[PDB]
Amino acid sequence: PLVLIGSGLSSEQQKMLSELAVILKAKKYTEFDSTVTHVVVPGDAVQSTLKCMLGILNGCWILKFEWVKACLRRKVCEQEEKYEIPEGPRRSRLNREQLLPKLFDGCYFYLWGTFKHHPKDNLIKLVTAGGGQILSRKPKPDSDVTQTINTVAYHARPDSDQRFCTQYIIYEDRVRQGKVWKAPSSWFIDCVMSFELLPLDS
């Protein structure tokens, strides 16, 4: 059935969401897992929280808090389309509805060094949820261990090198050598929020 989760909600907001889960006869979780169907955000904006990002990568409804208010008001499951955060969340939801590849399908990620603002464990979860693969060893751009890989990234722009150069060294805040890019974790996060494989050339 329906499984609801809040992201960045205040005390009263979390209660209202609890009250709503009772009314719709749905689960309300505190921690995200793949069974989640709806993420409610406190305003009308997508947040760079783990919960929102995992919601986006899983193609969940990401909804304005007014949805909750409107639902309690009507005692009905309000058509979520009308309360959906536009851009990233909507694009990902439509992507899932069309049964298309996940955001990072065909992509590989090596997490370089330490991470103080976007914890490493969070990045790993996002890569996995987005259908990407974690590399345990730094990708050797000049080695045949790297250039012979056959994958393509579905979500790369039509004439991007990212369609076929799909390996990434992610570091905490030359851009490409062979099939491997170096990109800051801020780029990676921006990709999730936008549901786009954003250019590193542009």
- Check whether residue 127 and residue 172 sit in a common domain: yes
How buried is 30 (Cβ within 10 angstroms: 0-12 exposed, 13-18 middle, 19+ buried)?
exposed
- Check whether residue 25 and residue 104 sit in a common domain: no
- Check whether residue 94 and residue 106 sit in a common domain: no
- Residue 75 sits in a domain whose CATH number is 3.40.50.10190
Domain assignment present for residue 132? The answer is yes
Q: Which technique was the structure solved with, according to the deposited record? A: X-ray
Q: Hey, what are 153's tokens?
A: 């990234």
Specify whether the backbone of 59 is left (phi greater than 0), alpha (psi in -120 to 50) or beta.
left
How many Cβ atoms from other residues are within 10 Å of residue 67's Cβ? 21
Residue that finishes a domain, picked among 99, 121, 143: 99
Q: Hey, what are 106's tokens?
A: 């065909």
CB 106 within 8 A of CB 151: yes
Q: Hey, what are 57's tokens?
A: 């990568």
In sequence order, the β-bridge partners of residue 182 are: 169
Where do runs of H (alpha helix) occur along the chain?
A: 11-24, 50-57, 66-74, 88-97, 120-129, 144-147, 185-194
- Check whether residue 3 and residue 86 sit in a common domain: yes
CB 13 within 8 A of CB 47: no
Instruction: Look at strands 27-29 and 3-6 and give their pairing.
Output: parallel
Domain assignment present for residue 202? The answer is no
Alpha carbon distance 202, 198 (integer Å): 8
- Check whether residue 107 and residue 133 sit in a common domain: yes
In sequence order, the β-bridge partners of residue 29 are: 5
Count: domains in the chain: 2
Domain assignment present for residue 201? The answer is no
Instruction: Look at strands 180-184 and 176-177 and give their pairing.
Output: antiparallel
Q: Hey, what are 70's tokens?
A: 């409107």
How many Cβ atoms from other residues are within 10 Å of residue 116's Cβ? 10
- Check whether residue 175 and residue 83 sit in a common domain: no
Range of the domain at 143: 100-196
183 sits in which H/E element:
strand 180-184
Q: Give the closest residue to 126 by CA, choosing from 106, 149, 102.
A: 102
